[PDB]
Amino acid sequence: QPGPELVTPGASVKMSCTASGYSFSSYNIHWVKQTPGQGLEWIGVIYPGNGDTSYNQKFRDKATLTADKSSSTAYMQLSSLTSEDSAVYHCARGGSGLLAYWGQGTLVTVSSAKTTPPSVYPLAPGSAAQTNSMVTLGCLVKGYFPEPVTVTWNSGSLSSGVHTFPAVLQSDLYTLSSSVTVPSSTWPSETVTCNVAHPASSTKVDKKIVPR
Amino acid sequence: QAVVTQESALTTSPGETVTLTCRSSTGAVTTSNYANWVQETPDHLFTGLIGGTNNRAPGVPARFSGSLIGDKAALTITGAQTEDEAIYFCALWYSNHLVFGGGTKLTVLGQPKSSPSVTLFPPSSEELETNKATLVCTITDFYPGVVTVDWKVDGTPVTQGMETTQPSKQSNNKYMASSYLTLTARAWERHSSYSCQVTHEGHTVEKSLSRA
């Protein structure tokens, strides 16, 4: 507990490994930590056969592995949560000496950061080319925490040409862009929009891409 | 904790045979290291391939195989496919401690190479009211998926206040990216030219705008 990703510094999370790895095996169960920079880190392995656990020296005091043969469960419980533990914790099922099956991937975010609503700014074209003529438009979603946000175009009518780029961390705050492309028979003549919604604190914005 | 080294990147064509290696700084890679090989698809899915130096996980195609080349652990893909273009991670055992490698990003030429299309946006008027200015440069439709970006103000290079996203795969199996150059609204009115330079495979695509 829990898995909506956001937790307080000093808390203690507990995750579970579940999928359709089907009955039969699971002789060993590994746990992997993925993070932008440190890459893949091995926390430890549990052998559900008799309980035997192995831990990385780095995570021996912070990680605890349990598993039962009743509901095919396999848990990891962290504690003393620092913002260093902000990562994607994976699970790896398989037979003897095999990282065969991998799970979904539980996202974990540890931060003392306050919740901040996003602000959206329109991005007019101008003298900066967009390929094959047409009209490329977009919005700038800047300064929100935490993730994610959802961007649509023409109330959902407008697919194709849409390019919602991933968010770059920009000093404790997230920021992403999202381009879209329509013919000149739509812009600047008629409507283009652009709905950036932000779950965690709720927000809904409408931006008419008015020309420069 | 020893360190595990892999090749940064390799490129090949379908039908060809490619060999990836896995080096250990603290001596050589023997049979007692129980070499592991995990694949990560650009959609971040994670699938286990090899365990115990040369044991294919159940379900892995016959084109994958592991072995020891001299003093290094190796992965061999004979008859590579277009679907094999992904990042491959290596893992070596040490007493009771599993160390992962940096990973090898393999590119498989399944489609013709393509120069990226670049769009550049000037800061919006609303953000200027907050004494901030953010130029947005969108980079889409390029292959292979490796791109470096540089910025230029008034024809002169700026390496400050820049931020570029990592390449993510598009729906047409191409790649896309973006970059942001943040300045003050004061600096936005105290210079003239702005340029976003995208270098892909020796060639440079450049898009500029002048406040006029």
Author numbering:
A (entry chain A): 6 to 99, 101 to 218
B (entry chain B): 1 to 212
Extract from the study:
In order to generate antibodies with peroxidase activity, mice have been immunized against iron(III)-α,α,α,β-meso-tetrakis-orthocarboxyphenyl-porphyrin (Fe(ToCPP)). Two antibodies, 13G10 and 14H7, were found to bind the porphyrin hapten with nanomolar affinities and enhance its peroxidase activity. 13G10 and 14H7 are murine monoclonal antibodies that were found to belong to the IgG1, λ-class. The anti-porphyrin antibodies 13G10 and 14H7, with a λ-light chain, were shown to possess shallow hapten binding pockets compared with the other structurally characterized catalytic antibodies.
